[PDB]
Amino acid sequence: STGSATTTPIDSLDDAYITPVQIGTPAQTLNLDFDTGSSDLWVFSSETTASEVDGQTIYTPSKSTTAKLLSGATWSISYGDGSSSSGDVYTDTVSVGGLTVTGQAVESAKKVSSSFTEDSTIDGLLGLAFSTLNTVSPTQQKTFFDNAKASLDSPVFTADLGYHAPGTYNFGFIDTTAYTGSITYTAVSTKQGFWEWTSTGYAVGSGTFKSTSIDGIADTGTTLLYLPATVVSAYWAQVSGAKSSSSVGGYVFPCSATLPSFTFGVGSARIVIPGDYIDFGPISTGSSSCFGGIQSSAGIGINIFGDVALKAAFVVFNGATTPTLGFASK
């Protein structure tokens, strides 16, 4: 089997991407944030505290003839941005782009933190990291990809995120028309539960490539590119007037600037992020200070190849017995 679904930016900045997902019988379609940095499929629901729902579409398990309470199971998750959610668990039929999994754990939110409530466009998350990170207790549950894997034509999914435009998540096949050149594959460590890999270096604009190992995670659920402070300083030093602002929470730059590109290495291959992809717009409405799309990971503990980086590539998440990542230009 295969599946193919369009993913759409939630706003004009590509702050996140939503993909329609069918849950239950008859189908209830919710727009989920596919997140290769986490491993829970959770949804706003008829169980979510009413004051914490503000415009999201909810899953109502009592209206699904295939929903079953997973008795005793609870979940609770905290994300790197400080947001969180928790609740109980149903199993139900879940379909993405024509690919169907029966018995998928659908984690129903009883509580969500303010940033989820405040984002009416995201109805929940669909985790695509390794199932070892799934938070369901006392019986850990598998991701949608893990459940589908054995049925897929090939044990892979691909992320093809657009810049200010829709893109595609495919399951079970590699669309050879969706990228240019060849796909360069690179090793993955699953030791932390992430799609963790080592970039071979970087360049800023037309500058020379610096060969240096940068361990980080391919994370579709993180908006920006978070790299070591040395790398980030080297980038922003090429932008007149750019500075790190403690009060804003990162590097800002004059909105009048033209940003240089940023290149990262995948083995001997190179992925080029155009400068425009690094502009996240005014820090507040009407400001002439703009927020940068490349930020320091120093306070995180891990480097994160988020959407800013991934949207410049066609990315293969290869879930073979030994997982690997593939990157192609497009």
Describe this entry's structure for a reader.
It catalyses: Hydrolysis of proteins with specificity similar to that of pepsin A, prefers hydrophobic residues at P1 and P1', but does not cleave 14-Ala-|-Leu-15 in the B chain of insulin or Z-Glu-Tyr. Clots milk. It is an enzyme of class 3 (hydrolase). The active site is at residues 35, 199. With 330 residues, the protein is mainly β. The chain has two domains: 5-174, Acid Proteases (Cathepsin D, subunit A, domain 1, Beta Barrel); 175-330, Cathepsin D, subunit A, domain 1 (Beta Barrel). Helices cover 6% and strands 44% of the residues. It has a seven-stranded mixed β-sheet. Strand 6 and strand 7 (99-112) form a beta hairpin. It is globular, with a radius of gyration of 20 Å.
Structure summarized in a few sentences:
The PDB classes it as hydrolase. This protein has 330 residues and is mostly beta strands.
